[PDB]
């Protein structure tokens, strides 16, 4: 029990010793940081956890936020590894701290992880977010939190104090405040807190960078396969009101804001979850019903606006994407697409999938996309058509928003390091044609290959330690390099970025510059006319 | 004799010309039409009535009244295209070159239609000298003057006083004269290969698309032009707008009968002096009086016609030069000039797009800028310079020829395609301009064989291959004889480069670029 009993503001905690081949770590799981956002507190901001008295057992993970369970491929590891692995509940606002045993002599750098899941899903408890290996290897203190999702975390009737929007992000913020007030007791350094996250976790990290009351709560950021300025990452006041009303309709509520929210509040959570997807405007991929909302408080303006107008001198940021960001999403409703075969689509299906992958744009905009993503010597090649829709969805949802994010952060004074991740896990359950899909760098960052119970290769263990080292070097100093092949900063002029895989770092220039010119310069002029 | 030949119009006398390969008999200045003068200005041409006696044909005749280029006075690069004989409306003469002695058997015939944007040109230019091609390949060559400018293409559609397209009818009539007479010069009326460059190529295409030109030739060769090019033709409404503007510029009052009457009484120089100023904007690669879509010579727009398959499926050989656009840019694009590297600024690139692609929406300019920027390096002057040269040359020459070649191949025609990449040793234009529009002609015409000129040993060898390619196409429809030049097909799109090195096969003529101009851009324009 040495170093397993720790006192925090809320009270005494009991942790548990976790083991790794490189030695032990002290974990404190299921630490409450808010009063449960239950009953009358549904859709409300979170309130700090009142002091429990005595000793709170922190040896197990806690309930996961009520959320949709993916059923596309029941039993498949490639999807189920993202599904909840604990009982579902609204009583879900708990966080986790892993620290080395013994705790370092000197206050150690803190990494704070924010999971993705399109703001509709996720949990800090997934096998793939296990913090033991980063902590043991790099002697970092690591935190993660559950945050509400779906309607529970992002349904908004903007203007109301009863459903103001963005409460899932406020969940994250309150966790960050808990860290400032408490990680020292775990050996963590509150003056060196690096947020990192993936997809929606990465968009969440973007928003903390831009939300004024979050900015004194961390120092450096990392955004993996996501940006706050992506077309799926946020929604206007009006569109969030329309979707809220539509869920209220779908769960049986009659057709002011007070009585509407009261009705939402008396329905059971399963019922909210049952209807979530049908509030969207068209069948589509890469869109999610309840996402942050531009409320004029947490986000004083659109992310595009706030990034353009922001000063970022002496902020260090690290961002990137995987080689094949679009592929995963295509099996969720693009015709001709499956995990179970090479998904060699026809041309008609390609033409169709453009309207799913990029929903709610003019037929003229579709015409423009089709033009850009067609090899005009070989427009009928099924393979080329499959890969091109992948690029369309990849570029539009992940790569181009990250490229703009990066150009703008450098321009407005940030040191930026940027990567593309190009190693396909030896153990990957998805077929060859999906390439290095979205989400599949995370297990290398978290050092899962070091798990003896799993079956990665010698080289994959070496590669994970490189990545953990880059990420932890960034966290310590804002620079992922040490004396002894350099990762150079991304500037707006040269646009350097690096490929990460088994081979050494290779420096390249320009994250799909031609294609992102299309999404970022031209297409907004077309729609706007 | 050898030089006294009888034709339907009467007897001619020609002149023996000498080459290093031996002699040729050339008959220059043969009238094929009544002078299109006075009440005949703007009118269809009428066949030349039999003259009596012997018409001396040893001498090139007058050139159609036309604008004289004054951009760079005395520069061989511009002056070689300028008129080299006295100007006149009495300019409807054609020229025949045949071997000395004549061929034992009926020879293939090649008929040349000069370019010049339909505003300029003449058969008498040094560079269209037929003597080397005739000698070297035992081919009979014809070229005609045809009316340019307002004289050949001003139209008040509907009227019989100025119906449109008379420059083209001049060409048709010449082709008819070839049917009726090249036998007398040793040529074979059943093997007439039509070829031309720029506007001349567009012209050739218009004849392939025009029912009334139907049994007048058997194969065709379009160099650096296509009838479906956006400079090549104009609508009735636009032609009418422009003929009215010309009338106003020459002082006529603002009933087609009276307007043309007034246009007829002004002198030709007065028409030429106001010619550029009828164009809707300041631009490059636009010409004022061009073919009009009349429902007669052109039943419809050339686009509609090829897209519909309305054409003679003749064998064709078509191609372009490596830097089609560069020449035109010095004619009004800011920052351009033959006297430096023309390292334009980016603001100069953006204005340049409006000049090079005139009269399109703001949004369409945006789409062009998008496609023709390297976005890694949008500030490099060299790249911006070369990129505007691609914009201009793709829109006006290359993509129209590609669409022309796709549509011809899809409807069963044998199509050969080339990109010509040899920059002449003697080229007066700066490097930067690369291998510009027009600078393949000297090679096709075998000019390097002229001992008084300064071409390389390799250049003469090159020239012989090209005349060989062209002339094998003339005889057979196929330029090869026992490395292949393969047919261009709509699936594979194979074409060859032509320079010093042997043929290298390649695929798709700027396919990505031309998809922008041929598929995307029209859908955008018609949503505004």
Short mmCIF file of N, CA and C in Angstrom, two decimals, chain A residues 364 367-368 371-372 374-378 493-495 509-510 513-514 517-518 521-522 525-526 529, chain B residues 363 366-367 370-371 373-377 491-493 507-508 511-512 515-516 519-520 523-524 527:
data_model
loop_
_atom_site.label_atom_id
_atom_site.label_comp_id
_atom_site.label_asym_id
_atom_site.label_seq_id
_atom_site.Cartn_x
_atom_site.Cartn_y
_atom_site.Cartn_z
N UNK A 364 -23.72 21.13 -57.96
CA UNK A 364 -22.55 21.73 -58.57
C UNK A 364 -21.31 21.49 -57.72
N UNK A 367 -20.31 18.11 -58.40
CA UNK A 367 -19.69 18.07 -59.71
C UNK A 367 -18.21 18.42 -59.54
N UNK A 368 -17.95 19.45 -58.76
CA UNK A 368 -16.58 19.86 -58.52
C UNK A 368 -15.74 18.84 -57.78
N UNK A 371 -14.92 15.97 -60.23
CA UNK A 371 -13.86 16.43 -61.10
C UNK A 371 -12.49 16.30 -60.46
N UNK A 372 -12.36 16.75 -59.22
CA UNK A 372 -11.07 16.70 -58.56
C UNK A 372 -10.60 15.27 -58.27
N UNK A 374 -11.04 12.25 -59.71
CA UNK A 374 -11.18 11.29 -60.75
C UNK A 374 -9.89 11.34 -61.50
N UNK A 375 -9.29 10.16 -61.70
CA UNK A 375 -8.28 10.00 -62.73
C UNK A 375 -9.04 9.98 -64.07
N UNK A 376 -8.87 11.02 -64.88
CA UNK A 376 -9.62 11.14 -66.12
C UNK A 376 -9.09 10.32 -67.30
N UNK A 377 -7.92 9.71 -67.14
CA UNK A 377 -7.52 8.61 -68.03
C UNK A 377 -8.21 7.27 -67.69
N UNK A 378 -8.55 7.06 -66.42
CA UNK A 378 -9.02 5.74 -65.99
C UNK A 378 -10.23 5.90 -65.05
N UNK A 493 5.31 28.76 -44.74
CA UNK A 493 5.99 28.91 -46.02
C UNK A 493 6.33 27.57 -46.61
N UNK A 494 7.08 26.76 -45.86
CA UNK A 494 7.56 25.46 -46.35
C UNK A 494 6.62 24.26 -46.09
N UNK A 495 5.90 24.29 -44.97
CA UNK A 495 4.90 23.29 -44.60
C UNK A 495 5.50 21.91 -44.42
N UNK A 509 6.87 17.96 -47.66
CA UNK A 509 6.39 19.33 -47.71
C UNK A 509 4.94 19.34 -48.17
N UNK A 510 4.07 20.01 -47.42
CA UNK A 510 2.67 20.19 -47.87
C UNK A 510 1.65 19.06 -47.76
N UNK A 513 -1.60 19.69 -50.50
CA UNK A 513 -1.75 21.13 -50.71
C UNK A 513 -2.70 21.45 -51.86
N UNK A 514 -2.58 20.72 -52.95
CA UNK A 514 -3.47 20.94 -54.07
C UNK A 514 -4.89 20.62 -53.62
N UNK A 517 -6.27 23.10 -51.02
CA UNK A 517 -6.63 24.33 -51.74
C UNK A 517 -8.08 24.27 -52.27
N UNK A 518 -8.48 23.10 -52.75
CA UNK A 518 -9.84 22.90 -53.22
C UNK A 518 -10.88 23.08 -52.09
N UNK A 521 -9.99 26.92 -50.10
CA UNK A 521 -10.09 28.18 -50.82
C UNK A 521 -11.30 28.16 -51.73
N UNK A 522 -11.36 27.20 -52.64
CA UNK A 522 -12.33 27.29 -53.70
C UNK A 522 -13.75 26.96 -53.27
N UNK A 525 -16.16 29.53 -51.82
CA UNK A 525 -16.61 30.53 -52.79
C UNK A 525 -17.78 30.01 -53.63
N UNK A 526 -17.72 28.74 -54.01
CA UNK A 526 -18.78 28.13 -54.80
C UNK A 526 -20.12 28.11 -54.04
N UNK A 529 -22.81 31.55 -53.19
CA UNK A 529 -23.14 32.16 -54.50
C UNK A 529 -24.35 31.47 -55.12
N UNK B 363 -16.45 33.90 -60.28
CA UNK B 363 -16.32 32.54 -59.77
C UNK B 363 -15.53 31.62 -60.73
N UNK B 366 -11.88 32.20 -60.34
CA UNK B 366 -11.45 31.49 -59.12
C UNK B 366 -11.10 30.02 -59.42
N UNK B 367 -11.96 29.36 -60.17
CA UNK B 367 -11.76 27.95 -60.50
C UNK B 367 -10.53 27.71 -61.37
N UNK B 370 -7.51 28.25 -59.17
CA UNK B 370 -7.32 27.05 -58.36
C UNK B 370 -6.56 26.01 -59.13
N UNK B 371 -7.02 25.71 -60.32
CA UNK B 371 -6.38 24.65 -61.06
C UNK B 371 -4.96 24.93 -61.47
N UNK B 373 -2.44 26.86 -60.09
CA UNK B 373 -1.55 27.30 -59.08
C UNK B 373 -0.91 26.05 -58.49
N UNK B 374 0.42 26.08 -58.36
CA UNK B 374 1.13 25.22 -57.40
C UNK B 374 1.01 25.89 -56.00
N UNK B 375 0.26 25.27 -55.10
CA UNK B 375 -0.16 25.94 -53.85
C UNK B 375 0.85 25.83 -52.73
N UNK B 376 1.80 24.92 -52.91
CA UNK B 376 3.04 24.95 -52.16
C UNK B 376 3.86 26.25 -52.35
N UNK B 377 3.83 26.77 -53.59
CA UNK B 377 4.73 27.83 -54.05
C UNK B 377 3.97 28.80 -54.95
N UNK B 491 -10.33 5.18 -75.54
CA UNK B 491 -10.00 4.49 -74.28
C UNK B 491 -8.57 4.85 -73.84
N UNK B 492 -7.59 4.60 -74.70
CA UNK B 492 -6.16 4.74 -74.32
C UNK B 492 -5.48 6.11 -74.56
N UNK B 493 -5.98 6.87 -75.55
CA UNK B 493 -5.53 8.24 -75.86
C UNK B 493 -4.02 8.38 -76.15
N UNK B 507 0.39 9.20 -73.09
CA UNK B 507 -1.03 8.88 -72.94
C UNK B 507 -1.77 10.06 -72.35
N UNK B 508 -2.88 10.42 -72.97
CA UNK B 508 -3.74 11.48 -72.48
C UNK B 508 -3.12 12.86 -72.62
N UNK B 511 -5.00 15.41 -69.81
CA UNK B 511 -6.30 14.84 -69.45
C UNK B 511 -6.95 15.47 -68.24
N UNK B 512 -6.16 15.78 -67.22
CA UNK B 512 -6.74 16.35 -65.99
C UNK B 512 -7.16 17.78 -66.29
N UNK B 515 -10.21 17.91 -68.55
CA UNK B 515 -11.46 17.58 -67.87
C UNK B 515 -12.01 18.82 -67.21
N UNK B 516 -11.14 19.64 -66.65
CA UNK B 516 -11.59 20.92 -66.09
C UNK B 516 -12.28 21.75 -67.20
N UNK B 519 -15.42 19.29 -69.08
CA UNK B 519 -16.53 18.81 -68.25
C UNK B 519 -16.97 19.80 -67.19
N UNK B 520 -16.04 20.24 -66.37
CA UNK B 520 -16.49 21.03 -65.25
C UNK B 520 -16.95 22.43 -65.59
N UNK B 523 -20.65 23.35 -66.92
CA UNK B 523 -21.70 23.17 -65.90
C UNK B 523 -21.72 24.33 -64.95
N UNK B 524 -20.54 24.81 -64.58
CA UNK B 524 -20.44 26.04 -63.79
C UNK B 524 -20.98 27.31 -64.51
N UNK B 527 -24.78 27.60 -64.64
CA UNK B 527 -25.45 27.85 -63.35
C UNK B 527 -25.34 29.34 -62.95
#
